[PDB]
A paper describes a structure:
LASV GP is the sole antigen on the viral surface and is the primary target of the adaptive immune response. Three GP monomers associate on the viral surface to form a trimer that drives viral attachment and cell entry.
We determined two structures of lineage I GP (LI-pfGP) as follows: a 3.1-Å cryo-electron microscopy (cryo-EM) structure of LI-pfGP in complex with GPC-A antibody 25.10C and a 3.6-Å cryo-EM structure of LI-pfGP in complex with GPC-B antibody 18.5C-M30. The GPC-B antibody 18.5C-M30, which is derived from GPC-B MAb 18.5C, binds to a quaternary epitope spanning two adjacent monomers and bridging their GP1 to GP2 subunits. The GPC-B antibody 18.5C can be engineered to completely neutralize LI. Here, we determined the structure of 18.5C-M30 in complex with LI-pfGP. This structure shows that the two engineered Arg residues form salt bridges to Asp400 and Asp407 of LI-pfGP. Our LI-18.5C-M30 structure pinpoints the following three LI mutations at or near the GPC-B site that decrease antibody efficacy and, thus, are responsible for the immune evasion by LI: a deletion of position Y62 and substitutions at positions 198 and 397. In LI GP, however, Gln 397 cannot form stacking interactions with the 18.5C-M30 light chain, and by extension, likely fails to make the analogous contacts with 25.6A and 37.7H.
Author numbering:
A (entry chain G): 2 to 136, 144 to 223
B (entry chain b), C (entry chain a), D (entry chain c): 259 to 326, 332 to 414
E (entry chain F): 2 to 154, 163 to 214
F (entry chain C), G (entry chain B): 65 to 168, 182 to 195, 208 to 244
Write the structure that this text describes.
Amino acid sequence: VQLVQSGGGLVRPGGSLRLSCAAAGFTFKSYSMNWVRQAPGRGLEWVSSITSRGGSKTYYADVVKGRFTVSRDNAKQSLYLQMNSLRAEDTAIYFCARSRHSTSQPSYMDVWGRKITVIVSSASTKGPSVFPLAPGTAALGCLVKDYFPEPVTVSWNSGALTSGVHTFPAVLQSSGLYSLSSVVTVPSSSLGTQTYICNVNHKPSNTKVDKRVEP
Amino acid sequence: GTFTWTLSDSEGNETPGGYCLTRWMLIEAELKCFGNTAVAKCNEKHDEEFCDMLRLFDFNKQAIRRLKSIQLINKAVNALINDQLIMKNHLRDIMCIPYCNYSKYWYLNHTSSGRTSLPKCWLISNGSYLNETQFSDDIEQQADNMITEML
Amino acid sequence: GTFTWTLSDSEGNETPGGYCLTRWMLIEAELKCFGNTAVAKCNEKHDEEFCDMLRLFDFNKQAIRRLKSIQLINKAVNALINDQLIMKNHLRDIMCIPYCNYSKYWYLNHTSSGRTSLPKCWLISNGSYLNETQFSDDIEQQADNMITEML
Amino acid sequence: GTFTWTLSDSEGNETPGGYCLTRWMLIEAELKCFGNTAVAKCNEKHDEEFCDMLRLFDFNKQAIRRLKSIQLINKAVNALINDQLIMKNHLRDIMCIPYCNYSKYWYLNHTSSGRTSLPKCWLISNGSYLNETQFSDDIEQQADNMITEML
Amino acid sequence: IVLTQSPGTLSLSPGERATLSCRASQSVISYYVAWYQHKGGQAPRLLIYGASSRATGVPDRFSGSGSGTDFTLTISSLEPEDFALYYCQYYGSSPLWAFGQGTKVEIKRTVAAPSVFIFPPSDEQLKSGTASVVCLLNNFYPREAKVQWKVDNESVTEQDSKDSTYSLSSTLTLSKADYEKHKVYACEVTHQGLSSPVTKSFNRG
Amino acid sequence: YELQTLELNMETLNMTMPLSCTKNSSHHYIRVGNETGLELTLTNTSIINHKFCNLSDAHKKNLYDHALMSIISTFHLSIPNFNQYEAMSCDFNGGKISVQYNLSVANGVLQTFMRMAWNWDCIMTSYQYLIIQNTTWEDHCQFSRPSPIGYLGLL
Amino acid sequence: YELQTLELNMETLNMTMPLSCTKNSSHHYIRVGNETGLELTLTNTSIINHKFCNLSDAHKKNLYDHALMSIISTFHLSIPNFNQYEAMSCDFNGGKISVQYNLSVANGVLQTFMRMAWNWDCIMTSYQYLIIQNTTWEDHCQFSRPSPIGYLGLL
Ligand SMILES: *[C@@H]1O[C@H](CO)[C@@H](O[C@@H]2O[C@H](CO)[C@@H](O)[C@H](O)[C@H]2NC(C)=O)[C@H](O)[C@H]1NC(C)=O
Ligand SMILES: *[C@@H]1O[C@H](CO)[C@@H](O[C@@H]2O[C@H](CO)[C@@H](O)[C@H](O)[C@H]2NC(C)=O)[C@H](O)[C@H]1NC(C)=O
Ligand SMILES: *[C@@H]1O[C@H](CO)[C@@H](O[C@@H]2O[C@H](CO)[C@@H](O)[C@H](O)[C@H]2NC(C)=O)[C@H](O)[C@H]1NC(C)=O
Ligand SMILES: *[C@@H]1O[C@H](CO)[C@@H](O)[C@H](O)[C@H]1NC(C)=O
Ligand SMILES: *[C@@H]1O[C@H](CO)[C@@H](O)[C@H](O)[C@H]1NC(C)=O
Ligand SMILES: *[C@@H]1O[C@H](CO)[C@@H](O)[C@H](O)[C@H]1NC(C)=O
Ligand SMILES: *[C@@H]1O[C@H](CO)[C@@H](O)[C@H](O)[C@H]1NC(C)=O
Ligand SMILES: *[C@@H]1O[C@H](CO)[C@@H](O)[C@H](O)[C@H]1NC(C)=O
Ligand SMILES: *[C@@H]1O[C@H](CO)[C@@H](O)[C@H](O)[C@H]1NC(C)=O
Ligand SMILES: *[C@@H]1O[C@H](CO)[C@@H](O)[C@H](O)[C@H]1NC(C)=O
Ligand SMILES: *[C@@H]1O[C@H](CO)[C@@H](O)[C@H](O)[C@H]1NC(C)=O
Ligand SMILES: *[C@@H]1O[C@H](CO)[C@@H](O)[C@H](O)[C@H]1NC(C)=O
Ligand SMILES: *[C@@H]1O[C@H](CO)[C@@H](O)[C@H](O)[C@H]1NC(C)=O
Ligand SMILES: *[C@@H]1O[C@H](CO)[C@@H](O)[C@H](O)[C@H]1NC(C)=O
Ligand SMILES: *[C@@H]1O[C@H](CO)[C@@H](O)[C@H](O)[C@H]1NC(C)=O
Ligand SMILES: *[C@@H]1O[C@H](CO)[C@@H](O)[C@H](O)[C@H]1NC(C)=O
Ligand SMILES: *[C@@H]1O[C@H](CO)[C@@H](O)[C@H](O)[C@H]1NC(C)=O
């Protein structure tokens, strides 16, 4: 049995959000529910809990008490997590899971769900800028800077060379914009032979910039 | 076999049946008397433990008064209790699983009516007692039939 | 353990269930037929004296008919009866309380309907059978069940 | 005494209660799982010949894992099973009557809902099994119950 | 409860047995302890529920034991798809769900020599806004690496199945007017395989 | 509205409980553990003719398989009554197991047979000796599938 | 709908039934009546050196307290697979009470203690002797509240 749901995304600071976990394929009322998040780099964190078909006993994490409310609707069989007054530490991936808590059964979350990305940002999406990194065996790179947390695709020579290419995942910044660098290493023979062009395609604003890096 | 003893009732009871524990068989508590309806469920199920304690209390109460050694219980050990509860709890303990130590119980009371559930004993594990949350659903599942008890 | 025997049924019975006593089984009486509704409560009780007697009667019928010493009941006694009732009655007798003796019974007969009740047994106390008014409320307590039988 | 064990349940079940049976202890079948409603009836009847086998399966399942001889079942046999069923079937076979060997069982499936009922068992006599017609009324009797399950 | 794993990161190759340890502070009920597996994309799995038990769909290479404040999770044999994050979990106390910090199991190999490169800015980056220089290391092992920058004397990918050897980048950033102060800048990196430090620098121009 | 049948396999309950099956009224099979196997054979002949055996040192010599002695102990105990003369005899030299009963009284042993591998009277069989022996795995369970109730009921 | 707890006091069931309580891992207090008391302990030291002791004269003397010997009777009867060979270090001279054994077979007696006051393998405690003693009305029952079901389980 599996749980299907959707939600999350980009929200500006100070807004309000709703997480929905829908249920299908099991007797809903006879089970307890948990909401758990995973921040980038660290271990999982509690977010909320709720007990079985009473809506009576409610528990929240020690850190995040107050800004969250958790509820369950048996008529539509939905977990509703209402978030108010968003902070800058809520950027993470959420899981909605289910477990039962009795004498015979030990405690375990078995039917998990789908991870849900949630991110807070002040500015909107702004197209990045592409920088060149031309130098036995050497290496050359394409860098993109002033980049939005949404994913992009960066490619060498329209994907002709797919060997020895390393793309670095975005890392925490200071200003508030991600960035990423890609490097490809080739022996001395290949230098000056094949045309190498840095291609960046970014779905928000659909920025499709192709710069032919040449001397 | 099967337990055969019966509840002896009291004099000042508000209902024809139903036991009422006194002050001397409780710790840091007063005398409490359960409803007759709750006690009516003891003689119809073999998977309960509190009614065994009531049967032992009643047997002792009649033994002290109506008679002036210990073969009275050797001859009547079966008529009062069920040895398989002891065996089952022993097997749960030997498998490193929560079991019941026959000492303290949890019940569910109603603020106004006073109708009460049949207590089930609190569970232990290796000298350490549980928290309320660890069996939350139990606490609420009985609550459900409370609504069903209204029908 | 628990009693496990069943009912052999009859040929001319109106209803598939039910057991009809013979004339040669009673004293100064005729054959009597109990409804299936009344006898359906034997397999869901443990504190009755009539149903044990019916189990013994069934076993006697089958043993005398389908076979041709005494070890049979020496091996089947736990199956047919429940020794804890014997212990309970013996304890009530040693402590001087009115008690049953598996000799004579009482029931309620509805003349028009023909539906009867499970006969709870009479009580003796030191060579003196009880008199009717003493357990008056019981005689009417089961009467209330007939009202609930209208449903 | 009385059986006292409880069913362990499994992770990944449709409902909280209900015992799902795997494919390593069946013949010519895969894993097969029963509804919780049918499971709810084992803890209230003593003449059922099936739930004893579920109890034995669960005891072995929980003894293989959380352990590392045979005296365990010597101590737990009473808490697991009811020897009176064995004696009942033995006395019934020695009188040349069809009896249940606890080998194969029949249940009343329902095509859409899947609310399978609690199976009784196929009987046997002198090495020959029976036919569907010989217990026709039985096959129909439980059917009536499922109609009352609609209420 | 304070609940920690040990060791922080494990390095082993298939063939032998390995152990992970979970330690707490308060007294622990063994019946409410779970062990969880977290891979890259797929949702986390239920490796073990119970102090020493079995899941519905888990291989037989896993086992658990322990008591008191010690928990041992032992894997007798490995697999190409058994290298991800692990967690030990307790129910109750404070808060109700006490997840662990983290664990990671990797593969063991001999030492390798990193390939080093340095990339300074260009003349067009006056349109960038702020100057950046990239000190890049590729194909090094093990994880122990330290990077520093010197005047006048972070980003990582995941371990790859085809190679199992890491990469590292440093993006030093300086404001436009602030760059015209000095002319020589160095980046230095040290790692246990090369006891002698190797430092590389560039001259403005 | 549809009838179905399921047949349970009693082979999984291997070590938790001893099992038993039937080929023919001559010999009965007992299996314990992973492989340990006992035969209960009815035969007119005698394979051993020693005149002295006893049980105290059988458990006292203490080098035996202690998970096996239990079934023969419960067999020895479950028979209703016993003759003062020790017609039955035993021999465990060399580690082997051999328990012989001189049938040529039989009522109790025949009901024990009726129960171990499962009208009421003292009819006896034409066979004159019971031999209780070790055996290999081989195959003794083909006519009827093995079951555990042959031993649960006599405990 | 509110939750409450209650705790029974087993002290009232005083003379009808024996009671038992625990101090630590090697101490057990048994009480019957009002003043009589037994100590069940595990200890590394031997006391009685009398190798001869029979149980017939114990009940035959009739000067003993006949409401107490039954408990130790059930105690040495409930232990399983007891050889009845030797090491029975009993002593009751002068009307006193003393029972002790070697632990170096111990699996059964340790299981007996675990049942009489409250994996599964042949656990070997480091203590070498089991001491049965008379005692006075002290305050043993303080680590845990005494309960009567320890004796019910053995019976
Ligand atoms: C002894 O019992 C074991 C335990 O059930 C049997 O082994 C099982 O066999 C089935 C059928 O092949 C497998 O699905 C299980 O995985 C096995 N379990 C284990 C733990 O190995 C074994 O077959 C039995 N012995 C005999 C001779 O039948
Ligand atoms: C032995 O049992 C008796 C019977 O319960 C105990 O006497 C009772 O003690 C309580 C507690 O104060 C009183 O409320 C009762 O009135 C007493 N009943 C009597 C005197 O008949 C007695 O305390 C117990 N003694 C020991 C040492 O356990
Ligand atoms: C449990 O506590 C008792 C009493 O507190 C301990 O009894 C000790 O026994 C030794 C002889 O074996 C005496 O010398 C001591 O005076 C006793 N009292 C003590 C040590 O306080 C008993 O040893 C304790 N149990 C264990 C396992 O240590
Ligand atoms: C339940 O509550 C009522 C009112 O507070 C009280 O009178 C009664 O004693 C309680 N039940 C018990 C068992 O004490
Ligand atoms: C009950 O009464 C009817 C008619 O009055 C009679 O036929 C029937 O036999 C009676 N029942 C018994 C058990 O005798
Ligand atoms: C029943 O009544 C008679 C006289 O009416 C009386 O002697 C007898 O004692 C009464 N029964 C009992 C049990 O007392
Ligand atoms: C009952 O039948 C349905 C189909 O008619 C099937 O899906 C289901 O598995 C059956 N129940 C069992 C317990 O096998
Ligand atoms: C019980 O708790 C104690 C701590 O007092 C611990 O040392 C022990 O390992 C736990 N388990 C058992 C079986 O004693
Ligand atoms: C129970 O809850 C308390 C919080 O008051 C906590 O300290 C303890 O660790 C929990 N678990 C127990 C007592 O097993
Ligand atoms: C039973 O079969 C075995 C097969 O080994 C045979 O030796 C024996 O004689 C047979 N006995 C009877 C009575 O058929
Ligand atoms: C039992 O038989 C053996 C075998 O000869 C013999 O040595 C021994 O004395 C007999 N008695 C006892 C008590 O072992
Ligand atoms: C049965 O096992 C014993 C154990 O040593 C052995 O001596 C004997 O030869 C075995 N019987 C066989 C293999 O027929
Ligand atoms: C077995 O019993 C028969 C009785 O007919 C007897 O003739 C034979 O000698 C006995 N076998 C012995 C004692 O070994
Ligand atoms: C054993 O002897 C009896 C009569 O002496 C005979 O009927 C039976 O067939 C014999 N059994 C064998 C296996 O020869
Ligand atoms: C215990 O009681 C017996 C029986 O009278 C007595 O002989 C013995 O001295 C008593 N022991 C103590 C320590 O009082
Ligand atoms: C234990 O055995 C030794 C002989 O090795 C003996 O001296 C001692 O008295 C025995 N102790 C007990 C308590 O039986
Ligand atoms: C008893 O002796 C054993 C073995 O020498 C030892 O392990 C144990 O600690 C001793 N117990 C004491 C001294 O209380």
